[PDB]
Scaffold this active site. Sequence first.
Site, PDB file in Angstrom:
ATOM      1  N   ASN A 189      -1.517   8.370  -5.700  1.00  0.00           N
ATOM      2  CA  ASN A 189      -0.519   7.914  -6.679  1.00  0.00           C
ATOM      3  C   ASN A 189       0.053   9.060  -7.522  1.00  0.00           C
ATOM      4  OD1 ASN A 189       0.981   6.542  -8.631  1.00  0.00           O
ATOM      5  ND2 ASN A 189      -0.579   4.986  -9.015  1.00  0.00           N
TER       6      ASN A 189
ATOM      7  N   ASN B 185       5.458   1.836  -6.537  1.00  0.00           N
ATOM      8  CA  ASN B 185       4.790   0.881  -7.426  1.00  0.00           C
ATOM      9  C   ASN B 185       5.740   0.358  -8.501  1.00  0.00           C
ATOM     10  OD1 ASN B 185       2.258   1.413  -6.079  1.00  0.00           O
ATOM     11  ND2 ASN B 185       2.166   3.332  -7.236  1.00  0.00           N
TER      12      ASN B 185
ATOM     13  N   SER C 149       5.953   4.842 -10.234  1.00  0.00           N
ATOM     14  CA  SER C 149       5.196   5.842  -9.504  1.00  0.00           C
ATOM     15  C   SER C 149       5.247   5.519  -8.008  1.00  0.00           C
ATOM     16  CB  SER C 149       3.745   5.879  -9.988  1.00  0.00           C
ATOM     17  OG  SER C 149       3.140   4.600  -9.856  1.00  0.00           O
TER      18      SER C 149
ATOM     19  N   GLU D 128      -4.845   1.470   3.849  1.00  0.00           N
ATOM     20  CA  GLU D 128      -3.875   2.074   2.935  1.00  0.00           C
ATOM     21  C   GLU D 128      -2.577   2.456   3.650  1.00  0.00           C
ATOM     22  OE1 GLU D 128      -3.775   2.145  -0.217  1.00  0.00           O
ATOM     23  OE2 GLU D 128      -5.835   1.800  -0.899  1.00  0.00           O
TER      24      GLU D 128
ATOM     25  N   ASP E 181       5.560   0.398 -11.724  1.00  0.00           N
ATOM     26  CA  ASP E 181       5.749   1.285 -12.866  1.00  0.00           C
ATOM     27  C   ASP E 181       6.649   2.486 -12.556  1.00  0.00           C
ATOM     28  OD1 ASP E 181       3.949   2.670 -11.274  1.00  0.00           O
ATOM     29  OD2 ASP E 181       2.674   3.308 -12.932  1.00  0.00           O
TER      30      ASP E 181
ATOM     31  N   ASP F 135       3.016   6.027  -4.138  1.00  0.00           N
ATOM     32  CA  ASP F 135       1.805   6.400  -3.404  1.00  0.00           C
ATOM     33  C   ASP F 135       2.170   7.155  -2.124  1.00  0.00           C
ATOM     34  OD1 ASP F 135       0.492   4.898  -5.343  1.00  0.00           O
ATOM     35  OD2 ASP F 135       0.161   3.183  -4.025  1.00  0.00           O
TER      36      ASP F 135
END
Length: 129
Positions: A59, A46, A50, A35, A48, A52
């Site tokens: 998220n 991301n 958002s 990750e 959309d 991380d």
Amino acid sequence: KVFGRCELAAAMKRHGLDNYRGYSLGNWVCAAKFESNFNTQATNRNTDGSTDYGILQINSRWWCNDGRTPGSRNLCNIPCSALLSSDITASVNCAKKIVSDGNGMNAWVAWRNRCKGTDVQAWIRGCRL
Ligand SMILES: [Cl-]
């Protein structure tokens, strides 16, 4: 902070992640490696809108507040910046809530694709725990 592999394993163990909800320590270390490459300061945006955050790439769509993901939730009740600390306490406590939500570690895409069904114990091999 960029953790060493065994250093992170020991921190995670201390914070109660070893066998948390049936997931051995190796699963958590493997997830963190893929990750964030063990870097607490990792961020990724991301599609959309958002973002991380941190060593486990939590998220902002569901788990934390970053003030820039409209219509999102803050289920861990924390600013997303708290997940970037060299102290992993906030990330772990939030991860415990995520992994308990019914989908287990499948919430983490890199875990599903790169750790799940592999010999995850290899990730803590040689570590003083
Ligand atoms: Cl599960």
